[PDB]
Design a protein around this ligand. Structure first.
Ligand SMILES: CCCCCCCCCCCCCCCCCC(=O)OC[C@H](COP(=O)([O-])OCC(O)COP(=O)([O-])OC[C@@H](COC(=O)CCCCCCCCCCCCCCCCC)OC(=O)CCCCCCCCCCCCCCCCC)OC(=O)CCCCCCCCCCCCCCCCC
Ligand SMILES: CCCCCCCCCCCCCCCCCC(=O)OC[C@H](COP(=O)([O-])OCC[N+](C)(C)C)OC(=O)CCCCCCCCCCCCCCCCC
Ligand SMILES: CCCCCCCCCCCCCCCCCC(=O)OC[C@H](COP(=O)([O-])OCC[N+](C)(C)C)OC(=O)CCCCCCCCCCCCCCCCC
Ligand SMILES: CCCCCCCCCCCCCCCCCC(=O)OC[C@H](COP(=O)(O)OCCN)OC(=O)CCCCCCCCCCCCCCCCC
Ligand SMILES: CCCCCCCCCCCCCCCCCC(=O)OC[C@H](COP(=O)(O)OCCN)OC(=O)CCCCCCCCCCCCCCCCC
Ligand SMILES: CCCCCCCCCCCCCCCCCC(=O)OC[C@H](COP(=O)(O)OCCN)OC(=O)CCCCCCCCCCCCCCCCC
Ligand code: SF4
Ligand code: SF4
Ligand code: SF4
Lengths: 176, 156, 360, 97, 318, 80, 115, 70, 55
């Protein structure tokens, strides 16, 4: 159930002593290493041509946040604050009130994308699939406060990426 | 005029020379150093973009703060940044280098390296993918491309 | 250049993880562990999960145990690729770095397909795992593992027989066995010194007593035997991965107590008890019975332990994190007595240190 | 000999991009010369190509448009220019364009 | 018109250095299963121009603590000695035909150490001084065999003349009678030029950048191009020593193309050894060139003294 | 001496090759028939001018023309 | 004459690549960028302290073997002499004396480094 | 694939083919369509200075054969 | 996989192993990106009888 790495005594007949001395004087293993490096020289390299080719992803992928809507236009967030209660970085800040037609909807729904740890607890705690963590990951900013998303930026990410988020959730939701 | 054309083509020349020869310094801090190494890995391969490691700050262009900046290494980050020649740039990688991150309310975390160094590009993620870090580097190259150094100098 | 004293000042990545754990629930404290040993994410998840399940008096299903062992061995391949390739980078051979990070890229794709994030998964949770394996993932794990042996073979072709590599590792950083135990070394830092000890054999957890593998033991306590132990642990990790692919059971992937594991979303949205349990788990969290435990597993750096103190509430009272790298970096002071600056770099290489878990 | 077949494959990649001018176009805009099965095009001009003989990562690419939303993207191509219906297929989230 | 001859020597061997940076990065890329630079030009052919323009428009950064006269005088001497070791090299006719050109090459090999040496000392930093004295610990190891190997290879030539070393190898390559001297000379030229596995001065992982850890861009380019000029010059010198080609006196271009492709194969061999090996500890360097190469080199020196006497094969000095 | 020779070839083969090459270089020029031709070629190479002598009358071996039958000949160099 | 022109040209466009490197870019000098580099933190003491040489006996012996290649160097010329047994004997005696010196420095552990 | 290194090497080869070939041409331009007269030894320099004297135009590469004598 | 048999043979000679049997580049043999919808099994306590929580 155990093995001894490096416990081989070298043979001491004239054949193997001459082989080790030719290895010392004629550098067998150094030519072996050069042969392996030359063997990787003649290969097709694994470099994809980004930004024209994209690395492979799964429909489970956790990128930029987005608030979804029902297939009626009504947004799914009903202000229940499970996503900010489960959020391990406390990046989510929610404040709500009953709106003009008496519905439990949010007024403030902020996700600080510089606190957020992209772990997808908010999308798996959300009981109505409102907040999801979408497939975009190329959303770098030149300014720090552009990564402080309010409700309007999250709703625009939802209305931007819904045609892809709906298909990822459609391919994935049976595992949840 | 003629001189506007001269300084415009010289700006395009020096912006090309500075965006297609970015030499980042070997500077990781935390988990994001692993994904910065994967941005150097043979799949994504920074080196094809002219983006190659130089170990000393004197011989490097952009400082990728990749990881968590604590209170104990904030002056080390600042003196590394100061010992970079101008033009020097900063790419912020990961949530802790952006805004404090997962350790935001900690007693010993500098809440973002924008408190310490001037930051050009913010790359978001915990960690951002190496594809997203390469996106941030290409957006830094786009930011260098539209600089107007000699055009403003000829117009000042 | 003969080194007389090393003083490793650390705390440059100390972020106060285990005080932030005191103010968050157990599910909110789980993604701190991915960020301790940032090349051994699911191993730290598995250690914290075994600690919380030990305090909760519950156990995972069989499939979640085999998933934990399969991805812990994928994690062991990740960590020993990182160890060997950065050690050869620090000695000077920067080539198998690039050769083995393609394989490490493909195992990050396995993490991305199983959990959605490439590095920090938050996947191995107290109660099993979060989400079941997607279809065709095990076939691609097989297609990876069938070919990874030649990658280890060509790494070993480049470095093991090489005389420049043997000149940098063989008389360097010798650790005697009694000073290995008396410094709290663990894992390969014991096994390079010839000590017959491995936590997956002596204190067996989830289904490691049901798999068959061999525990590589060194003979001279140096950097070269620890190198060979890491390479052979990659070999035996491929062996355990083959045994886990062949012997995967069907069934569920969470413990079927819904007062610990969250219920499924297809039955959270239909049942009332399941909605109440979903609510109270993702807001309050499960109450852990009070008491302390020290749960230590064989992370690929060594004994990784969580000393977890619970006080009856849904938050940890205290969570001490024993990392292998802390005691190993304490032993760096002895190991660098009688070497040089070009050997202290190789000793920092042979002590596989990741400073998140060293620093918390 | 198969070396002349390599030179023929090079010449038919030259002839495949619409002549030498289009070959120089895709070379200096892509740093990539290979031809592919033109799967699709969006409402902007992004040409989406397959080649299932290439290895997994080179097998689906996009040649971006030259003018999207009023920006001259002939050289300033951006990875975020892909619309979300093709962002599944390009990032290999699906087999279906 | 001789000034035109000097300029047509020294400008193409700066452009050869420039495109050697591209060749180095792409061959190092494909040997490491990645690609090299291929974005900046057509398959990377314009990357060296950007790498060259970028360094002469970046801030020069003379340090505070530096001895500024020596700090600026060291890369000047580096690039000067990088250029002036090409002038006796027969291509098939050298720029400056010296009777004693081999000892000129050896003396300017010895003088080039003061570039690294005064640069590491003058930039008053600690890693710079460590690299500057590891340059001493490397130079006292390679110079104490670099003379005897080069002495023994000229005992079959007849003189210290590089131009006669083409007439000498008209029948056979000189790597056939002196392949131990050749495979030891090649390692001594590896250790001479601070190329891997003998980097040890610009040691990226022991030191930060070693002797030029303070040299920011502009003064840093004249060590980078000096090192690459030394490797191209040194592979050309090794080609002239051991792999000499056919010289048609009416067609010098046959010899020029032939030793050009041979010296390119030797430079690719430098890049291919750099992409495969770990790096020495610099005592194991000193316990190599003194304890392994020097006794065998003295034995081969006795052999190549006594062997032309033994076989009546003493070469002419004329 | 033989077991020690295999032992030192197993320990320090570089030194065995060094002493072997040095020993051959010492002893083997005393075992060559060609070593005479080395010094003969060296003393048969006319660097300086072969200064003529005044013919007093009695020098039958000193020639009067460079193509005379008498004098030192280098046909052994052409044949070898 | 041509050698001095070549050396002056090489020195000239070595120092013409330095004066277009200092006088071309834009400088922003302040008293932290020109500080000594010691990996982010301050150097504990100056670099002008005695940096002790451990390879010192080998460093002296370099000077006594560097004279040997001032003695052994005319061997391509000294083979052209007409006193060849004596030349061969003195040549192999000088390489043998170098080898006896190296063997004595071997056995007295002088090529080994201190500490 | 690998053959993309073959352009850059070629350019470096061009940059190593330019100097030596050029000086060959230069040694045939300023020396009358022939090689440059090699004076490694002082006797060769005396013959070369004799050629410079007998040429009549103070150039050593101007040759005078049997047409110069009567 | 498109490496010609001269380069393929030189590459196998230089490595010393058979490389086309074990390629580190992935091709058509890997799983489909679009998978069929699954049916995950329920645990042991998904029962309507003899399933009290206290036991
Ligand atoms: C060194 C001498 C030249 C070697 C030529 C060479 O590499 O041929 C590739 C050829 C096949 O190489 P491979 O590694 O199997 O790659 C297969 C391709 O991926 C399969 O080919 P492909 O499907 O990738 O076809 C596209 C490719 C086809 O490749 C070519 O046309 C290569 C042209 C090289 C010239 O064409 C291009 O990419 C366009 C040309 C870009 C490279 C231009 C290089 C110029 C070099 C001179 C300046 O190599 C050989 O047949 C063996 C070497 C022959 C040496 C002959 C004696 C000298
Ligand atoms: C061997 C390879 C290298 C070859 C040499 C380099 C090739 C390119 C040569 C021209 C580069 C452009 C000039 C140097 C770069 C100046 C960049 C810069 O900071 O410009 C702003 C500077 C200063 O502009 P400023 O007034 O805005 O200053 C900014 C700084 N503050 C605000 C702090 C005061 O511009 C110049 O100094 C003008 C430079 C001359 C323009 C070009 C002249 C012809 C050169 C040929
Ligand atoms: C110029 C064109 C190319 C030339 C050929 C070279 C191409 C290949 C290059 C490969 C990459 C090398 C990179 C650097 C490697 C550095 C390490 C290294 O190799 O160190 C040297 C190594 C060092 O070995 P080591 O490191 O194991 O040292 C052993 C030390 N002890 C024992 C104390 C542990 O080998 C040598 O020193 C060998 C030198 C050359 C030997 C030549 C012998 C010729 C034959 C002599 C006669 C033998 C028979 C006896 C007489 C018979 C008479 C009939
Ligand atoms: C009055 C008239 C004179 C006025 C003064 C100007 C003098 C000449 C200055 C040089 C030429 C000016 C133009 C510079 C480039 C401007 C155009 C440009 O930037 O085009 C962009 C394009 C690269 O696009 P990119 O975004 O990188 O592509 C991504 C890949 N999909 O770019 C390209 O495709 C090619 C870019 C080429 C850059 C220039 C070529 C290199 C410089 C050579 C000359 C200078 C150096 C000489 C030698 C010095 C020593 C080495
Ligand atoms: C001994 C041999 C030494 C050889 C050294 C050089 C080796 C490499 C040679 C060059 C190889 C090809 C390089 C091509 C680069 C890309 C050219 C190009 O197309 O640039 C486009 C750029 C922008 O064009 P624009 O009009 O803005 O495009 C918008 C279109 N809607 O437009 C521009 O940037 C403006 C035009 C710039 C053109 C620069 C081309 C390269 C010049 C390199 C200098 C050397 C020239 C030859 C010297 C040796 C021979 C004398
Ligand atoms: C006749 C011609 C002139 C011969 C003398 C001149 C030779 C010139 C060549 C250069 C020699 C320079 C260096 C010589 C050093 C010899 C002493 C030596 O190294 O002894 C120690 C060595 C064992 O090494 P160790 O103790 O381990 O060293 C510490 C590092 N590990 O111990 C050994 O390795 C054993 C050394 C002694 C026995 C060597 C036997 C070699 C036999 C080869 C065939 C015969 C060749 C003829 C020469 C006579 C040999 C006895
Ligand atoms: S992904 Fe995690 S850190 Fe980010 S908002 Fe959601 S719960 Fe919070
Ligand atoms: S996003 Fe979901 S979990 Fe958060 S408050 Fe809205 S409905 Fe509740
Ligand atoms: S932002 Fe997060 S994942 Fe990234 S380095 Fe920081 S702690 Fe690690």
């Amino acid at each position: 159930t155990y093995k001894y790495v490096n416990l081989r005594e070298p043979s001491m007949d004239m054949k193997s002593v001459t082989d080790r001395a030719a290895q010392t004087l004629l550098w067998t293993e150094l030519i072996r290493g050069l042969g392996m490096t030359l063997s990787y020289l003649f290969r097709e390299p694994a470099t994809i041509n980004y930004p024209f080719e994209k690395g492979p992803l799964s429909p489970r992928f956790r990128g930029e946040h987005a608030l979804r809507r029902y297939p009626s236009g009504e947004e799914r967030c009903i202000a229940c604050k499970l996503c900010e209660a489960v959020c391990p970085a406390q990046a989510i800040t929610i404040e709500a009130e009953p709106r003009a037609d008496g519905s439990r909807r949010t007024t403030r729904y902020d996700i600080d994308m510089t606190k957020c740890i992209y772990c997808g607890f908010c999308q798996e705690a959300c009981p109505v699939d409102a907040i999801v963590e979408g497939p975009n990951f190329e959303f770098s900013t030149e300014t720090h406060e552009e990564l402080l998303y309010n409700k309007e930026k999250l709703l625009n990410n939802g209305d931007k990426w819904e045609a892809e988020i709906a298909a990822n959730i459609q391919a994935d939701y049976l595992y949840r | 005029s003629r001189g506007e054309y001269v300084v415009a083509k010289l700006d395009d020349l020096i912006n090309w020379a500075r965006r297609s020869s970015l030499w980042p310094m070997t500077f990781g801090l935390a988990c994001c150093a692993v994904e910065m190494m994967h941005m150097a890995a043979p799949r994504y391969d920074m080196d094809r973009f002219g983006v190659v490691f130089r170990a000393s700050p004197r011989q490097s262009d952009v400082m990728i703060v990749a990881g968590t900046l604590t209170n104990k290494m904030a002056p080390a980050l600042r003196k590394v940044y100061d010992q970079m020649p101008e033009p020097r740039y900063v790419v912020s990688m990961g949530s802790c280098a952006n805004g404090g991150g997962y350790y935001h309310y900690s007693y010993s975390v500098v809440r973002g390296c924008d408190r310490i160094v001037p930051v050009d590009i913010y790359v978001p993620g915990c960690p951002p993918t190496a594809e997203a870090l390469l996106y941030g580097i290409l957006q830094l190259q786009k930011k260098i491309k539209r600089e107007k150094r000699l055009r403003i100098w000829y117009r000042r | 250049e003969m080194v007389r004293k090393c003083d490793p000042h650390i705390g440059l990545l100390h972020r106060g993880t285990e005080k932030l754990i005191e103010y968050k629930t157990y599910l909110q404290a789980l993604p701190y562990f991915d960020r301790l040993d940032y090349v051994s994410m699911m191993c730290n998840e598995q250690a914290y999960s075994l600690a919380v399940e030990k305090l909760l008096n519950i156990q995972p299903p069989p499939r979640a145990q085999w998933i934990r062992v399969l991805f812990g061995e994928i994690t062991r391949l990740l960590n020993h690729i990182m160890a060997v390739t950065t050690h050869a980078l620090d000695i000077g051979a920067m080539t198998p770095f690039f050769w083995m990070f393609e394989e490490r890229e493909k195992m990050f794709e396995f993490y991305e397909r199983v959990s959605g994030a490439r590095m920090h998964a938050a996947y191995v949770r107290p109660g099993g795992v979060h989400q079941d394996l997607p279809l065709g993932l095990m076939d691609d794990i097989y297609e990876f593992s069938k070919n990874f042996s030649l990658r280890i073979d060509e790494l070993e072709e480049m470095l093991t027989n090489n005389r420049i590599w043997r000149n940098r590792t063989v008389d360097i950083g010798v650790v005697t066995a009694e000073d290995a135990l008396n410094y709290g070394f663990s894992g390969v830092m014991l096994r390079g010194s010839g000590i017959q000890w491995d936590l997956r054999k002596t204190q067996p957890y989830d289904v490691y007593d049901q798999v068959e593998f061999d525990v590589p033991i060194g003979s001279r306590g140096d950097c070269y035997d620890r190198y060979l132990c890491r390479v052979e642990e990659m070999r035996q990790s491929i062996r355990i991965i083959s045994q886990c692919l062949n012997k995967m059971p069907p069934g569920e992937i969470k413990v079927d107590d819904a007062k610990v594991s969250p219920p499924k979303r297809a039955e959270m949205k239909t049942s009332m008890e399941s909605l109440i349990h979903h609510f109270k788990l993702y807001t309050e969290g499960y109450q852990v019975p009070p008491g302390a435990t020290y749960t230590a597993i064989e992370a690929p750096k060594g004994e990784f332990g969580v000393y977890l103190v619970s006080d009856g509430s849904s938050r940890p009272y205290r969570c001490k994190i024993k990392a292998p790298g802390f005691a190993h970096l304490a032993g760096l002071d002895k190991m660098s007595k009688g070497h040089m600056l070009a050997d202290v770099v190789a000793i920092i290489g042979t002590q596989d240190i990741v400073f998140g878990e060293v620093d918390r | 000999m198969e070396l002349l077949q390599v030179l023929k494959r090079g010449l038919q990649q030259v002839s495949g991009h619409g002549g030498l001018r289009g070959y120089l176009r895709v070379l200096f805009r892509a740093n990539d010369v290979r031809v592919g099965t033109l799967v699709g095009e969006d409402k902007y001009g992004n040409k989406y190509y397959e080649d299932n003989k290439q290895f997994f990562g080179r097998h689906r690419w996009v040649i971006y448009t030259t003018e999207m939303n009023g920006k001259n993207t002939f050289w300033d191509v951006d990875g975020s220019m892909v619309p979300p219906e093709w962002h599944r297929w390009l990032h290999c989230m699906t087999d279906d364009p | 018109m001789f000034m035109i001859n000097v300029l047509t020597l020294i400008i193409p061997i700066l452009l050869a250095v420039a495109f050697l940076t591209l060749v180095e990065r792409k061959v190092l890329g494909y040997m490491q299963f990645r690609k090299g630079p291929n974005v900046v030009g057509p398959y990377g052919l314009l990357q060296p121009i950007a790498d060259a323009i970028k360094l002469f428009i970046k801030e020069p950064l003379r340090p505070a603590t530096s001895s500024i006269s020596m700090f600026i005088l060291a890369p000047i001497l580096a690039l000067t000695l990088a250029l002036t070791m090409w002038i006796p090299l027969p291509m098939p006719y050298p720029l400056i035909n010296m009777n004693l050109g081999v000892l000129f090459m050896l003396a300017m090999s010895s003088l080039a150490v003061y570039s690294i040496l005064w640069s590491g000392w003058a930039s008053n930093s600690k890693y710079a001084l460590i690299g500057a004295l590891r340059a001493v610990a490397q130079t006292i190891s390679y110079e104490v065999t670099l003379a005897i190997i080069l002495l023994s290879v000229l005992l079959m030539n007849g003189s210290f003349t590089l131009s006669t070393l083409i007439i000498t190898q008209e029948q056979v390559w000189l790597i056939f009678p002196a392949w131990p001297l050749a495979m030891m000379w090649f390692i001594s030229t590896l250790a001479e030029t601070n190329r891997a596995p003998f980097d040890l001065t610009e040691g990226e992982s022991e030191l930060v950048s070693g002797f030029n850890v303070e040299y920011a861009a502009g003064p840093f380019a004249l060590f980078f191009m000096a090192e690459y000029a030394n490797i191209i010059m040194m592979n050309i010198f090794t080609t002239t020593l051991f792999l000499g080609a056919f010289h048609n006196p009416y067609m010098p271009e046959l010899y020029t193309i032939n030793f050009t492709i041979k010296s390119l194969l030797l430079s690719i061999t430098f890049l291919w050894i750099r992409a495969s090996y770990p790096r020495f500890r610099y005592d194991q360097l000193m316990h190599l060139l003194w304890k392994n190469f020097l006794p065998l080199t003295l034995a081969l020196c006795m052999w190549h003294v006594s062997l032309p006497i033994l076989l009546s094969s003493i070469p002419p000095q004329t | 001496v033989a077991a020690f020779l295999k032992n030192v070839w197993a320990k320090e083969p570089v030194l065995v090759a060094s002493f072997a090459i040095a020993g051959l270089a010492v002893i083997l020029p005393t075992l060559s028939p060609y070593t005479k031709y080395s010094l003969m070629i060296n003393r048969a190479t006319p660097y300086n001018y072969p200064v003529p002598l005044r013919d007093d009358g009695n020098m039958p071996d000193v020639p009067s023309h460079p193509q005379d039958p008498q004098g030192p000949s280098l046909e052994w160099l052409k044949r070898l | 004459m041509n050698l001095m022109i070549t050396l002056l040209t090489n020195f000239t466009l070595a120092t013409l690549l330095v004066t277009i490197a200092f006088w071309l870019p834009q400088l922003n000098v302040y008293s932290e960028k020109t500080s000594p580099y010691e990996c982010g933190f301050d150097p504990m003491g100056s670099a002008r302290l005695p940096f002790s040489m451990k390879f010192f006996l080998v460093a002296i012996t370099f000077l006594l073997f560097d004279l040997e290649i001032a003695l052994l160097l005319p061997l391509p010329w000294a083979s052209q002499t007409t006193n060849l047994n004596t030349m061969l004997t003195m040549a192999l005696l000088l390489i043998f004396l170098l080898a006896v010196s190296l063997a004595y420095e071997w056995t007295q552990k002088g090529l080994e480094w201190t500490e | 694939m690998w053959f993309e290194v073959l352009p850059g090497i070629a350019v470096m080869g061009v940059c190593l083919f330019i100097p030596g070939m050029a000086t060959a041409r230069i040694h045939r331009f300023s020396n009358g369509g022939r090689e440059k007269r090699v004076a490694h030894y002082s006797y060769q320099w005396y013959l070369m200075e004799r050629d410079r004297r007998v040429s009549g135009v103070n150039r050593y590469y101007v040759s005078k054969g049997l047409e110069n004598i009567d | 996989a498109s490496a010609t048999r001269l380069i393929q043979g030189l590459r196998n000679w230089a490595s010393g192993r058979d490389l086309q049997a074990k390629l580190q580049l992935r091709y058509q043999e890997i799983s489909k990106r679009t998978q069929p919808p699954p049916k995950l099994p329920v645990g042991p306590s998904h029962r309507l009888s003899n399933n009290y929580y206290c036991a």
